[model samples]
Target: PLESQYQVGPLLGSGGFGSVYSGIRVSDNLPVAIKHVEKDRISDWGELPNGTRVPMEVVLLKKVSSGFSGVIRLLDWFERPDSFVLILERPEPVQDLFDFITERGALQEELARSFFWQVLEAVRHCHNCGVLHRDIKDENILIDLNRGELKLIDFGSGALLKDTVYTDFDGTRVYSPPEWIRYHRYHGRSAAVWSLGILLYDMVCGDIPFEHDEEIIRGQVFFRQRVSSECQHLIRWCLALRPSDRPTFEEIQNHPWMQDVLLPQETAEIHLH
Candidate 1:
């Protein structure tokens, strides 16, 4: 059965799409976050190669269900002539990775390993499901601080297998691959790997791997920065220009960083308030 009214409550946060509200699902009596996407503000609906426009949220939610865990759970969706509403599971308060890093200074090797393993697992799951998380940044990887649970959220740029190859420009400028910046043919999965590499570097170094200047980021200087030897090989694997050079999820999972289980007991407790 479909829901009647949204029943929006307290404010959660806002993004490019629309404001997210803490709401009560009248049908199931479950707590949910209703993201109201302003149709007029949405620049791109789900336009296929043939130029047929579809609902963006439907394409995003349907395709993202298979391979990720850290992302917010999609419950139900509805559309109106003016706006689109996505009913999502309300998780515990998200721990901002930026703040987490700022408080901890540099992440220890063991901690880096833990974070790296979880990220790889999530990406692997997405890949297996034939979906690509075009934007893989620290902001998107929200943590349940108390429980150490990670939930990958935000599907604004995720695309399905059939819609994998895109000629149009998309994704954050910092995370966008050189090929995408150049308007050349590229795969989202490979670009996602490079972003992952940058993330790993940030986890250990407490800053971005390359200079922030656009000119530098667009040049070879950005790609030539030296990273630590701990996950150096893996980092290089992810930063590879060709997607084939990048390591698969299996390899990442089986790597030394993920294999050591006796490292530390870092758990998260979820409390919905």
Candidate 2:
């Protein structure tokens, strides 16, 4: 089916657990990312309104794809007897943020601002949609170099957003809050906001502030590179020891540091509360 609808090309990249190849839509010649993954990795299942059972990622992506541009769009998918294939939009001239930060240490404040605003807006919308991208991290995001924008990709191991704490999970999270490390249970909002802090720091400071679990629970965020007073204050506030102490999406956007950034007209309206 994929062969008739789309053509897969050279391997773009692969990591500890996978491979994504360059792809082209046969009819329109639109470029897409052919993400080849094992079905077992999806791990979770959910029902659409019509009661059709599907992989949670498919349901979630389909839900969010309607009105958002920050998250990757799932163009199409097909089931394999032994695996799964996800056709995704592949923006050209984009850079892997993890590698980008490593090469260009301490990215410009304005540049980081552009990417940060998009990501924050995306996360907020995901939450609004009642979804949790449990796998937020540098590795899961991309920077569109031409537009100075970001695409929050791969919501691997994600689940519906719930008010209570999560006790057990199978997939790994690159970013974790103090509560998860110490108590082994973390609230959805708290954990996501904490990740926003880490992502912000990594983008503007060239590295994450804390290295080990021991360092994280102490709630200390020492800057490796000199960051603005407003930025530093925000980071520390987000890294607060108590899970309840972290700021909400509304609060973070209202902060002076984040306040100055521009958001799309639609996303901006949602913030006026």
Candidate 1 off by > 4 Å: 1-10, 24-29, 43-54, 66-68, 162-164, 211-228, 241-244, 261-265, 269-273
Model 1, range 11-32, lDDT digits (tens) per residue? 8778674787888878657777
State the lDDT at 170 in candidate 1.
Answer: 51
**Residue 48 in model 2: shift from native, Å?**
3.2
**What value does the lDDT take at residue 132 in candidate 2?**
90
Best by lDDT: 2
RMSD of each: 4.8, 4.6
Query: For model 1, what is the alpha-carbon lDDT of residue 217?
Result: 37
Scored by lDDT, model 1 comes in at 0.65
Error of 1 at 29 (Å): 6.3
Count of clashes in candidate 1:
11
lDDT of 2 at 228: 90
Model 2 earns a TM-score of: 0.90
